[PDB]
Design a protein around this ligand. Structure first.
Ligand SMILES: NC(=O)c1ccc[n+]([C@@H]2O[C@H](COP(=O)([O-])OP(=O)(O)OC[C@H]3O[C@@H](n4cnc5c(N)ncnc54)[C@H](OP(=O)(O)O)[C@@H]3O)[C@@H](O)[C@H]2O)c1
Ligand SMILES: O=C(O)CCc1ccc(-c2cccc([N+](=O)[O-])c2)s1
Length: 315
């Protein structure tokens, strides 16, 4: 099955296309090809600075009569500098304007950490620490709720929230909408067993980001573990006559996760979608889960003293 049921009654495609670090000079073509070969879910964000070019691609394939709006599942995220209640709607509407859409299927709080409002995406003080804002998770959530009630977004969710931060929203007095989704980093080196259990036990769908280990992440170091180059995973891939990337995308699908691999290379965009014709064995799944090392692609040292930094908690 290609889609999973959210708590708002809508169905979310379990395979989507990532767009972080897809350059605007290349992302329009990426999205066009993705839609041609079957993708219906695109993961976006204002901070990725390419939503206009994503929107160009979508508008065109709508104009070519390739897909209908209703068939697409478009996700975007509220950036950290817009957590103030007064700023949330304008942030969403800028995303809608850039994407040339009149609604989003899902809008996420990108990180639990609010940052000082201003033009800079990562405002730092003279010593490198992020400058926080005096915002909290619950008031930001309340502002997200308003986006649903105004018809700008069909579903709201969170990203990079630890289980206590999710619990805060769940237990919120006067809660109007539960989060539909928690989008978190998840791959064989960061398997997230406890947070997935927690989220699934609350009827929150989990989306796995950086499923290939984000080899293009800008702070990569040579010493770092490399999933796509891991000979153990290559050996499971060769057993199935599939690529390592295909095994890494199939793995979260078999854990009832959504997964959003990124590529701007047309060959790979097509490759990565061809994951519905094979199954990883029980042994393969156990093997892959065994590779956990609690290794994160996305954790900025610059935010570790923020009151809402998510990764001090075990999960
Ligand atoms: N919520 C958040 O905080 C958050 C954080 C990180 C990521 N995300 C979302 O998750 C998406 C996926 O994560 P990611 O972008 O970090 O990394 P990823 O999907 O794990 O890895 C992307 C990298 O893998 C390469 N690649 C793709 N398919 C390949 C294949 N078949 N064989 C070999 N290499 C391949 C890509 O290269 P080319 O593109 O050059 O082909 C790119 O360098 C992001 O784009 C974003 O949408 C969300
Ligand atoms: O933006 C993306 O989706 C991928 C790019 C990023 C990587 C780390 C990011 C981050 C932002 C705020 C706070 C923290 N934190 O508390 O660790 C991390 S953003």
């Amino acid at each position: 099955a290609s889609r999973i049921l959210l708590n708002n009654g809508a169905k979310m495609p379990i395979l989507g296309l990532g767009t972080w670090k897809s350059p605007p000079g290349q992302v329009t073509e990426a999205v066009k090809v993705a839609i041609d070969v079957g993708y219906r879910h695109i993961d976006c964000a204002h901070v990725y600075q390419n939503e206009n070019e994503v929107g160009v691609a979508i508008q065109e394939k709508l104009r070519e009569q390739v897909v209908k709006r209703e068939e697409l599942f478009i996700v975007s995220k509220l950036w950290c500098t817009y957590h103030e209640k007064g700023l949330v709607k304008g942030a969403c509407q800028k995303t809608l304007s850039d994407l040339k859409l009149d609604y989003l299927d899902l809008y996420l709080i990108h990180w639990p950490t609010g940052f000082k409002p201003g033009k800079e995406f990562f405002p730092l003080d003279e010593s490198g620490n992020v400058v926080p804002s005096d915002t909290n998770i619950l008031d930001t959530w309340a502002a997200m709720e308003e986006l649903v009630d105004e018809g700008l977004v069909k579903a709201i969710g969170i990203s990079n929230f630890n289980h206590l931060q999710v619990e805060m929203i769940l237990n919120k007095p006067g809660l109007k909408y539960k989060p539909a989704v928690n989008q978190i980093e998840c791959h064989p080196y960061l398997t997230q067993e406890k947070l997935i259990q927690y989220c699934q036990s609350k009827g929150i769908v989990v989306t796995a980001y950086s499923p290939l280990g984000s080899p293009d992440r800008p702070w990569a170091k040579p010493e770092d573990p490399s999933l796509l180059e891991d000979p153990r995973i290559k050996a499971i891939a060769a057993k199935h006559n599939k690529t390592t990337a295909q095994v890494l995308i199939r793995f979260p699908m078999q854990r009832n996760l959504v997964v959003i691999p990124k590529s701007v290379t047309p060959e790979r965009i097509a490759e990565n979608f061809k994951v519905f014709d094979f199954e990883l064995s029980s042994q393969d799944m156990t093997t892959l889960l065994s590779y956990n090392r609690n290794w994160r692609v996305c954790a900025l040292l610059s935010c570790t003293s923020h009151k809402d930094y998510p990764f001090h908690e075990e999960f």
